Ligand binder design. Structure first.
Ligand SMILES: [Ca+2]
Ligand SMILES: [Ca+2]
Ligand SMILES: [Ca+2]
Ligand SMILES: [Ca+2]
Lengths: 445, 440, 440, 445
DNA sequence: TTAATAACCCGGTTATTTT
DNA sequence: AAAATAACCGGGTTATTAA
DNA sequence: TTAATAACCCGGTTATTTT
DNA sequence: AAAATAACCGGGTTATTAA
């Protein structure tokens, strides 16, 4: 059967939380204290080597008050029919079942009065609902819960694994083999994985993802990850560890966006920001996964032009039409753009750059809910609104009259030329500019 | 209310022991392993910090089998009707006490299936007798035995103390202060003391003593002690020698150290008395169970107001340890001659005749553990090694040079003795006390 | 002033090595013993906290014999006349400096008589050449080598850092943050870095490279590196495969992992390029000393201004790596017909007709480390496993269905393939590039 | 060879000490800190495993100031002729031996600059006198001092032992066997023994004794101990660890003083007081060993009477001539004491107590000269001035008219009747009384 | 009846006869 | 010269005689 | 001389003919 | 219906032609 819920009330970080669970569920976050204490919350209920020591003074919320620790595990237990897992758990709970028709089962922990005798006194109780919970009979040192479940903890009989930080003293090619053996191998059914490395998250299927937030209220969001899956997961494996992911389309934009972010603050990686190269203008294949994850996508797009196939003389918009499909709206009409054949070269592109503003001026109301949503659109490319902000400083580097002419020929080659000569006082006006609000929305400040 | 018996059946040394206890138990012996495992048996019965870990494979007897560990305590409450502990312990049992007419109570430990799941498991059972033992109810991690008793273990509610080796890093005046503090204050009511030092047993009264043995069968003797600084070192020895003089111990230390220097670790001890009295020592040592060996010398005494009328002191002094009637007085007329030398020499020839026609009285003396000479110890030493006395004294009579000043010329012997010399002291039947101390 | 050589003679892995060094130098390899013992060989020469303990039995080579341990550091100070560190070195050498025309300096360690007194003993010795080596004067516990240098060892005056494994308990952004700081700051002038992570080698300039081998003779190559995210993972391998496609790496991650999953620990690596350019990679890896293997495919391009005039780009991209002269253009006339499929099918026969009578050019291509196919990789994949493509695709022509979706139908072959299938791929001459990844 | 003297200047407790030390040194005292620092001073001079770590900040005088730690050892080298250790030390110091005529040799230590480089820098120097000290040549890690001396430290070539606390985890007969292995066995020549137990001092000959005082200035008393020896050392083995020793004569006088001393304070066992019972009126055999030790003797005696063996009618004083023999003075003349023959029993003793009081009246200058020295004399018997200050409370427990007559018949048997029941208010008036001034002179408070 | 020395045992001394 | 012999001291134990 | 697309290579999408 | 075919986007490399 599957896990359903856990209700950890008065443990050392939690107040009243209901984390939804599943088999094969993976824990990540920015804090290590909450990811350690969520595994010790499972060790205090299902493992006797932690349950035999009792509760100390430290694991009562902060250190005291509201002295009733409850950990309640939910495991449903109404699959019946085929599997031997449900039979091997229903054959031992026969004094604590209300009927053979209930659909939720309860494994409840209780602990009271740490102020007297300096002991936690864990009482375990079985039942089918929160009314009429009946305590677990056990003769000596061993409960009737401990005969059934088995807990194996890893840090460098129903079996539940608990793995904390396995990539420390592990090779980076071995983590992909461990990512195969955790998920597509049928040996492991019930684990609770805590990790920090993206190579353990390459091959995932039927997996609930618990993200632990960096704030002190330690609230968790549980999302199922259901699904070329491998290239969709390998590029997004470093973006699963970030709440705020900027989606840029090319490698030369990341060269400027690394330096502009590193000249302002080193702590954008510490806050949870990430730069993701899409490699093209295909943004819909990532946000269908990030809608299910709930990761806040930030999208920067540039609009372009295209002649129609069977129609000559009218042009079909590319960037506004591909921004239309991310919201699922009705596509706009085609705009007749005329180019005379006697003028070619740069001046056809120079007239089409002014046509890119002339298709932007009367479609500003379309951008009025685009930029109100999480998609941002430029006017020609990134190389022109780079020139509209710091273009008085680009002339001394290139030693040329028109730096846009020098940059559109070799695109990625001359973005290296902007790296080796910049100042810390330079390029702060492009940081606070309104045309680069995606990098404001990444850092959250 | 006070403890009566323990029944530790299948523990890691014990096989079937019924060890009688009381309050203020004191454990000594030549093995530290059996005393540590006795205190571990009390920790697996009454302490939750050792009960929460369970039994290992090594906690059973040998490496495997005889897999039913019983540690059963006997409390013997009866009805004392004024003490607060008995009313409290009959208040917390409630349903597991069968009647108010019963007097003996049981706390029973069980352990089964060590070969399955690699766990010993401890099951605790209350009851008024060995039949109809009922399980102790407990809700979570806490038994109802844990709400009654408290165990404090010392190694450098109802309170039980367990003290193992407190004289390591402790001054001896602090050992005497701990000795009066253990048996004077009312806070130390229940303990199980394990020690090696004689200074912790100076003040001692109303004390059960457990002497564990050096053998592997780990059987022990329990003796109640109810009522001198050198007698406290004799409590650590099963077999002691009762001698009269400080000059005798100088010879019996040199003769024992030239052959067998490890007689002290086997369990032997030499106890100086300082006189010919032995009835004050064996009346204590019979209650201890300590096997006494007595070497004494017979003497004679004249009467009062009579000349030539004598009685015997040393034969009647051995007779007073039995309870038999005294001997008749022996009359002898002594010649005048040399008073300093030959008047003693007539009495030494008379005392050999007195020992000759009272040999059948000595036949039940030396058959039991009291041994007796015929003149003194010095002529019996002169009959053994008198061919070696004249080569180091340069005198015609070495008994004459040594009877006047005894201790000052006894160190003239022991500074020059070879390792080959005095092998005949062990092989004499006259000096069988020094072989009876060894036990061969 | 910057280092040029070391001579670690009889240390516990080394027999006779003369390892060239420079500043900011980086050690990597497949053994951690051979990278720990290099930093301990520097700590035994230049750090007093390891030199004060002496040599043990295990610090010599093998368990015993070859009993003269020499660690010799070569400075090559020359005459720089402006820097602070050369004058700070030469002001305190004093009497051991021979003349001002000398350019080579020595620090010679010695060790003798390990079998006597259970002590290794370390004797330090300055000098300008290997003849006339004079001892370092030191009055008490402190040498005159200790007044010049300083060693700080990192494990989670003239200052030498020694860093061993810093990415253990370090975040992946912090490795790229540490990667610039070793090579732009003036504080880290002299270090010896040991690592396993590719993120610490992103920013890298003016760096001697020490690669230790997996063999037991622990010989190493000293290569200067002077001047990309996937290329930093290719620095930790000797045999790398240079492929064009991301869909092609999906094809070689099934064939390798169904037979030999331990190819990554042996020292193999798959490097995507993203295009048919290879001259930007092997011009870098010639200075790296990394043995490249290149798999490429030949193509043809019509020339501008003419109809039916073609030239061969795929042979010229193999010609430019060796520096030979280009080939001449060919003429072929192709009819109209079906332009999507049947126009390509005549070009495949013309490409095979080109590949038939240019085989003597390919005879030195495949004799070098560049490998060429016949039309494309998906069509001599059809020569290997084309009898098994019709089970999964259920199509008449599987390469008609595969060329229109190069990546979209490759996961159908990856997701449905047995372990017995694609085992004959390794013994083709067409797919013989993947055997030199393993090295068999 | 023969050690002479050490000179430890600026080490952890010492300021300027010249502690005379021969072969077979035995160290006792009330502090373990100064004995451990004396053995670590010998380890910082002659052991390379302590010299390779150097001096810290903590092993200067307080923690700083007087920045020259100097340990100078004298061995004096001038036995010549026969022994091979003298030939070994004159064969290894072939350079720094100035002549073969001077009879003093030095092994020095120097260290400076604790505040610079945080390192002690021990420099060792050989010399024949304090002028012209010469550095020891050593090639690498090993000095030329380390080839000669060998140091073995025990805590549970010239071979020098250092033993600290060996009686922990040993039997008492093993301590007697270890004393026989140390002193009368010729395996150990040079040692520095530190101990707390009396059983390691039973067999003892040719031994320099260092007593370390309990005060902070750590001054040491250096006395050579030369000598029935075995029972004298068994009597004095618990008295060598005490600086104030009371010399009493009986066990009844011991158990009188034991309850009275324990009801005031338990501090006197911690301070260093000890009651040594003799077993008779022989005191000259104890003070001849305490004069060589320097232990101050406190002596309680009682004066008696004896008839002369050759003259009838004149009595010879025993207790006054016994006190005269301890000072070596001229013995006083005999006093004619008349006893009629018809008066027998205890009626003779009642006049004999008055005749002893009449002897004590006219020889008051002699008892004043005795009590001006370290010997104390009673009026007649301890029981009479027991009765003179307690004996109004001795009639309520004996239920007798005369408690002196009730106690002189059973001297020990009725002495334990005072032990089991006395209040703590009792025997405070006699504790500052002048007749029991030895009991106040034991503790010195 | 009830204490007070003759005698004995484990040790120590000190000045007076004694051959 | 040097080797006893009484008379005490620090502890116990009878037992006859004085009281 | 000197840039500007015609072709080629490693990936992706979306409307328009086409049989 | 479903199978190509242009025309762009994110990167590189020649090479003939307009300029
Ligand atoms: Ca763009
Ligand atoms: Ca005798
Ligand atoms: Ca290809
Ligand atoms: Ca007296």
């Amino acid at each position: 059967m599957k896990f359903s819920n856990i209700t950890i009330k008065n443990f050392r970080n939690f107040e009243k939380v209901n984390i939804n669970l599943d088999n094969k569920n993976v824990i990540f976050g920015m804090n290590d204290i909450g990811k350690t204490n969520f595994l010790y919350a499972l060790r205090f209920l299902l493992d006797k080597e932690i349950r035999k020591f009792g509760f100390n003074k430290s694991d009562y919320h902060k250190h005291d008050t509201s002295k009733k620790i409850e950990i309640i595990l939910t495991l449903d237990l109404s699959n019946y029919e085929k599997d031997e897992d449900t039979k091997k758990l229903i054959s031992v709970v026969k004094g604590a079942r209300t009927s053979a028709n209930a659909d939720v089962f309860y494994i409840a922990l209780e602990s009271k009065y740490d102020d007297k005798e300096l002991y936690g006194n864990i009482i375990l109780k079985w039942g089918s609902e929160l009314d009429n919970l009946i305590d677990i009979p056990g003769r000596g040192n061993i409960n009737a819960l401990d005969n059934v479940f088995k807990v194996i903890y890893i840090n460098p009989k129903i079996v539940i694994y608990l793995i904390e930080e396995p990539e420390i003293s592990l090779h980076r090619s071995m983590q992909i083999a461990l990512s195969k053996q955790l998920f597509e191998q049928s040996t492991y059914k019930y684990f609770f994985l805590s990790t920090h490395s993206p190579e353990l998250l390459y091959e995932m299927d039927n997996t609930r993802l618990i993200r632990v937030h960096s704030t002190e209220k330690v609230v968790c969001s549980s999302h199922m990850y259901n699904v070329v899956k491998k290239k969709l997961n390998k590029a997004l494996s470093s973006a699963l560890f970030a709440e705020r992911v900027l989606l840029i389309e090319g490698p030369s934009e990341k060269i400027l966006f690394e330096k502009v972010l590193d000249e302002v603050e080193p702590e954008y990686e510490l806050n949870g920001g990430f730069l993701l190269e899409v490699g093209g203008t295909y943004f819909n294949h990532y946000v269908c996964t990030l809608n299910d994850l709930g990761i806040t996508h930030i999208i920067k797009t540039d609009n372009d032009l295209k002649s129609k196939k069977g129609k000559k003389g009218v042009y079909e918009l590319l960037g506004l039409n591909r921004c239309l499909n991310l919201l699922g709206r009705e596509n706009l009409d085609e705009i007749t753009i005329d180019i005379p054949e006697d003028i070619k070269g740069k001046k056809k592109k120079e007239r089409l750059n002014e046509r890119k503003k002339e298709i932007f001026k009367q479609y500003k109301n379309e951008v009025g809910e685009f930029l109100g949503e999480r998609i941002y659109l430029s006017e020609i490319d990134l190389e022109n609104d780079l020139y509209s902000a710091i273009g008085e400083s680009m002339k001394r580097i290139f030693e040329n009259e028109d730096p846009v002419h020098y940059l559109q020929k070799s695109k990625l080659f001359n973005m290296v030329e902007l790296v080796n000569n910049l100042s810390t006082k330079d390029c702060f006006d492009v940081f606070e500019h309104e045309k680069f609000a995606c990098l404001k929305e990444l850092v959250g400040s």
